[PDB]
């Protein structure tokens, strides 16, 4: 029956987070290619950008249509400083994906507290994807600690963003 | 040789405009489906959203990589009121696409003033797409003035967003 | 280990509800076609009837075989008045599907209370299908509020029950 | 021309009989598998259940649409005791199918008495299927009198419900 | 964020249980074939052995890599007495699979207590497989109570471990 | 004719050695991936684990069925310290495979001493595989002495564990 | 109508520039392979040589045939010193491609000044190719600043001049 307002707000914020994250990553992808001369790192980060700005926000929008929750569009993001090198750039992406896992955990917890079993279900996809996206990112961070050669690292990323 | 700062700013603003427009349309697509019961109108507007948030912003980002212009990410958009009915919604989309045509005209004009023939070229795509997107939108507005039946109109949009 | 009697009763009632619902819809499908001259509405409602009388009851019966819960067959249903028009008919179907969502929510809640994680799992399918069936039904109700032409509406349903 | 009320009532009862029979068999199929460890016997009886709850009731509903007879849905069935073993279970199914043959004979006889040659025709399908379903059932009963080995019997049923 | 130590220990024990179970079943498969002259029973039990020693332990190992839980390898198992006949052998396997269902239930319960929604998800696979493996095993136990002929039973198992 | 007890014991120990080795390697594969960031090294070592826990133990179990030797399952293995780096890890694996070659040599020697020409034959497979597995391992050890770049080494292992 | 002499001279010089550039690059390709042991760098530079000596000069020659401009062949080029290493070699190629962009910009500017809209069109291809060729070259220069290993760099160029 009736929609939970708490869940509605929590999913609107997550909508907001995926929009703004995806806009940050689109900038980070540009810089990976341009300043840092790592176009495959940039193609890995652009695919993560399109992920956040696509299905991560689409599923919420579609879910709201089915249960009567209200969509809210309030976006504010400015990319004001860039990490100093490619390593720090991908470590930054990592840190935001770890925060994704913490936010979706709060939403699952709330859904059980509300007895919103439809929302707990809806969020199970995000529960899993939080770890998948974090793992894929972690697989790139590891590269910068396994070789000091930008072109070696780039050649390895190629086989990941194929 | 040297990048024109005026063109750099003008293309950063157009980047900003396409991001924010595409975020507005993604909301407008939701409402077309949800409140107004017109899922094909919503699929037409979601495709326009993905257009603005995809190649419209990607081409600028890629162009900047080739000539040395600096990418700027500063986004601010809140969807605070929605048009009252489907007709007004698509008329609103129309009005923004007409403003797109005026903004790209300013950029072409500036590129000639700067003797930036690479930028005049780059913008020729946007020159044409301004009219194409406006025409496609206009083809939907016309529908609301040609029949008073939501389901008739919807069935016609289907053959456009195929 | 040991089967929860509470869950056994709750799933027997849901078995009962799907049988009786599916028998009501089979009658409602007939009337949609016969009295109301809407054979596609009738084919939409007959497919929902076969859904409830098929996998909705089969999954419970099969689940009981695996865990030792006892099947109970006690059916009582009489279709004693019919809604006055096609709109009211599909609105009636809607109202019962909304009650399905409330009943499956009670079963998920109980399964957690009982620490019956096998039953919480089994019910996740019903958790999702409650919203899917309700959405599909809602997509038909919307039609009667979007056009006053029976044949227009019928032509739209055709593309849903394909 | 005008519909015979006697035939209308006789076909409504047969509708009722097929619904309730099919609900009994769905329970009997469960028990064949669960208690009696004979899943192929259970698959034979589930197919007979779906037969009664499908085309046996659908043909009447569809026939009524063509001639103006009124559909009646009044169902009452409770499965309150189960036969003691698989043999007795299939003998029970047999006895109900023999009663099907007697009921359809009454309807053919009445249709001639009423000079309802459309209804005599419609019922010819049921005239034949009464003997076919009874024969298929009889082919399973014979198995329990031809071998004392549950797994031998099961392996034979497999080639019937293929 | 931070890994739950309780969950880490509970999943290490389950790792241990699947290793040792799979080593017991590999022995039980040998005996089913050798002493008891039932090679298909032995092929059913060898497939269950490879299941426990494969994906049942691999998924935990892979999950630990993604979240930072520590893998522990401490194995101790000796097969010191064998059941007296094939029936008792498969009943023994049954009893261990029923204990699997109880252990995974404890892990799901703990994951909710810890608000480890990633671990509750990870375990949902084990929640379902506990019942699937138990059912498949139960389907073999039933055979020894449905016929007194070893070769009849063997021929039936063949169609299960195909 | 009669089974040699000495050979029976020697093959039971080799059974034990392959089980426990394969359990150690499954842990070593995890660590290669997790701690050392070398997933292809980990995939090489996991394939060696599955080799030891599969056909290396299966062939003995199957051989015992044919000649009447008794299978013994007594397993004890705990992984209590891990080598400090990837190089030392693969050197450790090497050292155990060299001990495999010494153990199978003892079994061939004993089989001739016993005039067990069936067992000498059975062991010829292990005679050859001792050198093959050792060579494949040696091909990985050589990598750590041929380049100081983890990602270079990883890319080479990829073409071996294809 | 009448051909612009200014445009005729400007396009004859560009003809001259592409001939002489392409002859320089053919020498630079030889040296990349021979002295510097980088055959893929040499294959990248030979393809750029054939580009300048092919379509870059052919399009002008063909354009002159259509509008009545006079072809002039006056070539003077001697390769008298070579850059000291592969890096400096590709940086040299870069610097000449940047001068190409400046020369074609002068021709576009002149064509507008002359109201030679056919020549402005003809040159739009060169406007774009100036940036494309420069970008491809820049993608090779970046390699020498991303790794100190000639064979690593060579392996990367391979995937560009495929
Ligand atoms: Fe609120
Ligand atoms: Fe992806
Ligand atoms: Fe909405
Ligand atoms: Fe960098
Ligand atoms: Fe609660
Ligand atoms: Fe994702
Ligand atoms: Fe390489
Ligand atoms: Fe400026
Ligand atoms: Fe388009
Ligand atoms: Fe840039
Ligand atoms: Fe509207
Ligand atoms: Fe000018
Ligand atoms: Fe567009
Ligand atoms: Fe139409
Ligand atoms: Fe009770
Ligand atoms: Fe369906
Ligand atoms: Fe049962
Ligand atoms: Fe009506
Ligand atoms: Fe609890
Ligand atoms: Fe359903
Ligand atoms: Fe139409
Ligand atoms: Fe009457
Ligand atoms: Fe049939
Ligand atoms: Fe009727
Ligand atoms: Fe029985
Ligand atoms: Fe008569
Ligand atoms: Fe039948
Ligand atoms: Fe047979
Ligand atoms: Fe601890
Ligand atoms: Fe399996
Ligand atoms: Fe680990
Ligand atoms: Fe036995
Ligand atoms: Fe809690
Ligand atoms: Fe399993
Ligand atoms: Fe047989
Ligand atoms: Fe001995
Ligand atoms: Fe191998
Ligand atoms: Fe044996
Ligand atoms: Fe290491
Ligand atoms: Fe001898
Ligand atoms: Fe081997
Ligand atoms: Fe390579
Ligand atoms: Fe002149
Ligand atoms: Fe080219
Ligand atoms: Fe000429
Ligand atoms: Fe060099
Ligand atoms: Fe002019
Ligand atoms: Fe070119």
Coordinates of N, CA and C in Angstrom, one line a residue, chain B residues 5-127:
Chain B
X5 N 40.2 31.8 -25.8 CA 39.5 31.8 -24.5 C 38.0 32.1 -24.7
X6 N 37.6 33.0 -25.5 CA 36.2 33.3 -25.7 C 35.5 32.0 -26.1
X7 N 36.0 31.3 -27.1 CA 35.4 30.1 -27.6 C 35.4 29.0 -26.5
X8 N 36.5 29.0 -25.7 CA 36.5 28.0 -24.6 C 35.4 28.3 -23.6
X9 N 35.2 29.5 -23.3 CA 34.0 29.8 -22.4 C 32.7 29.5 -23.0
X10 N 32.6 29.9 -24.3 CA 31.3 29.7 -24.9 C 31.0 28.2 -25.0
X11 N 32.0 27.4 -25.2 CA 31.7 25.9 -25.3 C 31.6 25.3 -23.9
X12 N 32.2 25.8 -22.9 CA 31.9 25.4 -21.5 C 30.5 25.6 -21.1
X13 N 30.0 26.8 -21.4 CA 28.6 27.1 -21.2 C 27.7 26.2 -21.9
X14 N 28.0 25.9 -23.2 CA 27.1 25.0 -23.9 C 27.2 23.6 -23.3
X15 N 28.3 23.2 -22.9 CA 28.5 21.9 -22.1 C 27.5 22.0 -20.9
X16 N 27.6 23.0 -20.1 CA 26.7 23.2 -19.0 C 25.2 23.1 -19.4
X17 N 24.9 23.8 -20.5 CA 23.5 23.8 -20.9 C 23.0 22.5 -21.3
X18 N 23.8 21.6 -21.9 CA 23.4 20.3 -22.4 C 23.2 19.4 -21.2
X19 N 24.1 19.5 -20.2 CA 24.0 18.7 -19.0 C 22.7 19.0 -18.3
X20 N 22.5 20.3 -18.0 CA 21.3 20.7 -17.2 C 20.0 20.5 -18.0
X21 N 20.0 20.8 -19.3 CA 18.8 20.4 -20.1 C 18.5 18.9 -20.0
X22 N 19.5 18.1 -20.2 CA 19.3 16.7 -20.2 C 18.8 16.2 -18.8
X23 N 19.2 16.8 -17.7 CA 18.6 16.5 -16.4 C 17.2 16.9 -16.3
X24 N 16.8 18.1 -16.9 CA 15.5 18.5 -16.8 C 14.6 17.6 -17.6
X25 N 15.0 17.2 -18.9 CA 14.2 16.3 -19.7 C 14.1 14.9 -19.0
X26 N 15.1 14.4 -18.3 CA 14.9 13.1 -17.7 C 13.8 13.2 -16.7
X27 N 13.6 14.3 -16.0 CA 12.5 14.5 -15.1 C 11.2 14.6 -15.9
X28 N 11.2 15.4 -17.0 CA 10.1 15.6 -17.8 C 9.6 14.3 -18.4
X29 N 10.5 13.4 -18.7 CA 10.2 12.1 -19.3 C 9.4 11.3 -18.2
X30 N 9.9 11.3 -17.0 CA 9.2 10.6 -15.9 C 7.8 11.1 -15.8
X31 N 7.6 12.4 -15.8 CA 6.3 13.0 -15.5 C 5.3 12.7 -16.7
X32 N 5.8 12.8 -17.9 CA 5.1 12.4 -19.1 C 4.5 11.0 -18.9
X33 N 5.3 10.1 -18.4 CA 4.8 8.7 -18.2 C 3.9 8.7 -17.0
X34 N 4.4 9.1 -15.8 CA 3.7 9.0 -14.5 C 2.4 9.8 -14.4
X35 N 2.5 11.1 -14.3 CA 1.4 11.9 -14.1 C 0.4 12.0 -15.3
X36 N 1.0 12.1 -16.5 CA 0.2 12.3 -17.7 C -0.2 11.1 -18.5
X37 N 0.3 9.9 -18.1 CA -0.1 8.6 -18.7 C 0.2 8.5 -20.1
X38 N 1.4 9.1 -20.5 CA 1.8 9.1 -21.9 C 3.2 8.5 -22.0
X39 N 3.4 7.2 -21.9 CA 4.7 6.6 -21.9 C 5.5 6.8 -23.1
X40 N 4.9 7.0 -24.3 CA 5.6 7.2 -25.5 C 6.2 8.6 -25.6
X41 N 5.3 9.6 -25.2 CA 5.9 10.9 -25.0 C 7.1 10.9 -24.0
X42 N 7.0 10.1 -23.0 CA 8.1 10.0 -22.0 C 9.3 9.3 -22.7
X43 N 9.0 8.3 -23.6 CA 10.2 7.7 -24.2 C 10.8 8.7 -25.3
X44 N 10.0 9.5 -25.9 CA 10.5 10.5 -26.8 C 11.4 11.5 -26.0
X45 N 10.9 11.9 -24.8 CA 11.7 12.9 -24.0 C 12.9 12.3 -23.4
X46 N 12.8 11.0 -23.0 CA 14.0 10.4 -22.4 C 15.1 10.2 -23.4
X47 N 14.8 10.0 -24.7 CA 15.8 9.9 -25.8 C 16.4 11.2 -26.0
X48 N 15.6 12.3 -25.9 CA 16.2 13.7 -26.0 C 17.1 14.0 -24.8
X49 N 16.7 13.5 -23.6 CA 17.6 13.6 -22.5 C 18.9 13.0 -22.7
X50 N 18.9 11.7 -23.1 CA 20.2 11.0 -23.3 C 21.0 11.5 -24.4
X51 N 20.4 12.1 -25.5 CA 21.1 12.9 -26.5 C 21.9 14.0 -25.9
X52 N 21.2 14.9 -25.1 CA 21.9 16.0 -24.5 C 23.0 15.6 -23.5
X53 N 22.7 14.6 -22.7 CA 23.7 14.1 -21.7 C 24.7 13.2 -22.3
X54 N 24.6 12.9 -23.6 CA 25.6 12.0 -24.2 C 26.5 12.8 -25.2
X55 N 26.1 12.6 -26.5 CA 27.0 13.1 -27.6 C 27.1 14.6 -27.5
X56 N 26.0 15.3 -27.1 CA 26.1 16.8 -27.1 C 27.2 17.3 -26.1
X57 N 27.4 16.6 -25.0 CA 28.4 17.0 -24.1 C 29.8 16.3 -24.4
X58 N 29.7 15.1 -25.0 CA 30.9 14.3 -25.2 C 31.7 15.0 -26.3
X59 N 31.1 15.4 -27.4 CA 31.8 16.1 -28.5 C 32.6 17.3 -28.0
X60 N 32.1 18.1 -27.1 CA 32.8 19.2 -26.6 C 34.0 18.7 -25.8
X61 N 33.8 17.7 -24.9 CA 34.8 17.2 -24.1 C 35.9 16.6 -25.0
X62 N 35.6 15.9 -26.0 CA 36.6 15.4 -26.9 C 37.3 16.4 -27.7
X63 N 36.6 17.5 -28.2 CA 37.2 18.6 -28.9 C 38.2 19.3 -28.0
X64 N 37.9 19.5 -26.8 CA 38.8 20.2 -25.9 C 40.1 19.5 -25.7
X65 N 40.1 18.1 -25.7 CA 41.3 17.3 -25.6 C 42.2 17.5 -26.8
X66 N 41.6 17.8 -28.0 CA 42.4 17.9 -29.2 C 43.1 19.3 -29.3
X67 N 42.5 20.4 -28.8 CA 43.0 21.7 -29.0 C 43.5 22.4 -27.8
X68 N 43.4 21.8 -26.6 CA 43.9 22.4 -25.4 C 43.0 23.3 -24.6
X69 N 41.7 23.3 -25.0 CA 40.7 24.0 -24.2 C 40.5 23.3 -22.9
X70 N 40.2 24.1 -21.8 CA 40.0 23.5 -20.5 C 38.5 23.2 -20.2
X71 N 38.3 21.9 -19.8 CA 36.9 21.5 -19.4 C 36.6 22.1 -18.0
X72 N 35.4 22.6 -17.9 CA 34.8 23.1 -16.7 C 33.5 22.4 -16.4
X73 N 33.4 21.9 -15.2 CA 32.2 21.2 -14.7 C 31.6 22.1 -13.6
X74 N 30.6 22.9 -13.9 CA 29.8 23.6 -12.9 C 28.3 23.5 -13.3
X75 N 27.6 22.7 -12.5 CA 26.2 22.3 -12.8 C 25.3 22.8 -11.7
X76 N 24.2 23.4 -12.0 CA 23.2 23.8 -11.0 C 21.9 23.7 -11.7
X77 N 21.0 22.8 -11.3 CA 19.7 22.7 -11.9 C 18.7 22.1 -10.8
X78 N 17.6 22.7 -10.7 CA 16.5 22.2 -9.8 C 15.2 22.3 -10.6
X79 N 14.5 21.2 -10.6 CA 13.2 21.2 -11.3 C 12.1 21.5 -10.3
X80 N 11.6 22.7 -10.3 CA 10.8 23.2 -9.1 C 9.4 23.4 -9.4
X81 N 9.0 23.5 -10.7 CA 7.6 23.4 -11.1 C 7.5 22.6 -12.4
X82 N 6.4 21.9 -12.6 CA 6.2 21.1 -13.8 C 5.1 21.8 -14.6
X83 N 5.1 21.8 -15.9 CA 4.0 22.2 -16.7 C 2.7 21.4 -16.4
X84 N 1.5 22.1 -16.6 CA 0.3 21.6 -16.1 C -0.2 20.3 -16.8
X85 N 0.1 20.2 -18.1 CA -0.4 19.1 -18.9 C 0.6 18.7 -20.0
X86 N 0.4 17.6 -20.6 CA 1.4 17.1 -21.6 C 1.6 18.1 -22.7
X87 N 0.6 18.7 -23.3 CA 0.8 19.8 -24.3 C 1.8 20.8 -23.8
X88 N 1.5 21.4 -22.6 CA 2.4 22.5 -22.1 C 3.8 21.9 -21.9
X89 N 3.9 20.6 -21.4 CA 5.2 20.0 -21.2 C 6.1 20.0 -22.5
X90 N 5.5 19.5 -23.6 CA 6.2 19.5 -24.9 C 6.5 20.8 -25.5
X91 N 5.5 21.8 -25.2 CA 5.8 23.2 -25.7 C 7.0 23.7 -24.9
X92 N 7.1 23.4 -23.6 CA 8.3 23.8 -22.8 C 9.6 23.3 -23.4
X93 N 9.6 22.0 -23.8 CA 10.8 21.4 -24.4 C 11.1 22.2 -25.7
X94 N 10.1 22.4 -26.5 CA 10.3 23.2 -27.7 C 11.0 24.5 -27.4
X95 N 10.5 25.3 -26.5 CA 11.1 26.6 -26.2 C 12.6 26.5 -25.8
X96 N 13.0 25.5 -25.1 CA 14.4 25.3 -24.8 C 15.2 25.0 -26.0
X97 N 14.7 24.1 -26.9 CA 15.4 23.8 -28.1 C 15.6 25.0 -29.1
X98 N 14.6 25.9 -29.1 CA 14.7 27.1 -29.9 C 15.8 28.0 -29.3
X99 N 16.0 28.0 -27.9 CA 17.1 28.7 -27.3 C 18.4 28.0 -27.6
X100 N 18.5 26.7 -27.8 CA 19.7 26.0 -28.3 C 20.1 26.6 -29.6
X101 N 19.2 26.8 -30.5 CA 19.6 27.3 -31.8 C 20.2 28.7 -31.7
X102 N 19.7 29.5 -30.8 CA 20.2 30.8 -30.6 C 21.6 30.8 -30.0
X103 N 21.9 29.9 -29.1 CA 23.2 29.8 -28.5 C 24.2 29.3 -29.4
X104 N 23.9 28.3 -30.3 CA 24.9 27.8 -31.2 C 25.2 28.8 -32.3
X105 N 24.2 29.6 -32.6 CA 24.4 30.7 -33.6 C 25.4 31.7 -33.1
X106 N 25.4 32.0 -31.8 CA 26.3 32.9 -31.2 C 27.7 32.3 -31.2
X107 N 27.9 31.0 -31.1 CA 29.2 30.4 -31.1 C 29.7 30.3 -32.5
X108 N 28.9 30.0 -33.5 CA 29.4 30.1 -34.9 C 29.9 31.5 -35.2
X109 N 29.0 32.5 -34.9 CA 29.4 33.9 -35.1 C 30.7 34.2 -34.4
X110 N 30.9 33.8 -33.2 CA 32.1 34.2 -32.5 C 33.3 33.5 -33.1
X111 N 33.2 32.2 -33.5 CA 34.3 31.5 -34.2 C 34.8 32.2 -35.4
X112 N 33.9 32.7 -36.2 CA 34.3 33.5 -37.4 C 35.0 34.8 -36.9
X113 N 34.4 35.5 -35.9 CA 35.1 36.7 -35.4 C 36.5 36.4 -34.9
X114 N 36.7 35.2 -34.3 CA 38.0 34.8 -33.8 C 38.9 34.2 -34.9
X115 N 38.4 34.0 -36.1 CA 39.2 33.2 -37.1 C 39.6 31.8 -36.6
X116 N 38.7 31.3 -35.8 CA 38.8 29.9 -35.3 C 38.0 29.0 -36.3
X117 N 38.7 28.6 -37.4 CA 38.0 27.8 -38.4 C 37.8 26.4 -37.9
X118 N 38.7 25.9 -37.1 CA 38.5 24.6 -36.4 C 37.2 24.7 -35.6
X119 N 36.9 25.7 -34.9 CA 35.7 25.8 -34.0 C 34.5 26.0 -34.8
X120 N 34.6 26.7 -35.9 CA 33.4 26.9 -36.8 C 33.1 25.6 -37.4
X121 N 34.0 24.8 -37.7 CA 33.7 23.4 -38.2 C 33.1 22.6 -37.1
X122 N 33.7 22.6 -36.0 CA 33.2 21.7 -34.9 C 31.8 22.1 -34.6
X123 N 31.5 23.3 -34.8 CA 30.1 23.7 -34.4 C 29.1 23.4 -35.5
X124 N 29.5 23.2 -36.7 CA 28.5 23.0 -37.8 C 27.6 21.8 -37.5
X125 N 28.1 20.8 -36.8 CA 27.3 19.7 -36.3 C 26.2 20.2 -35.4
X126 N 26.5 21.1 -34.4 CA 25.5 21.7 -33.6 C 24.6 22.6 -34.3
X127 N 25.1 23.3 -35.3 CA 24.2 24.2 -36.2 C 23.1 23.3 -36.8

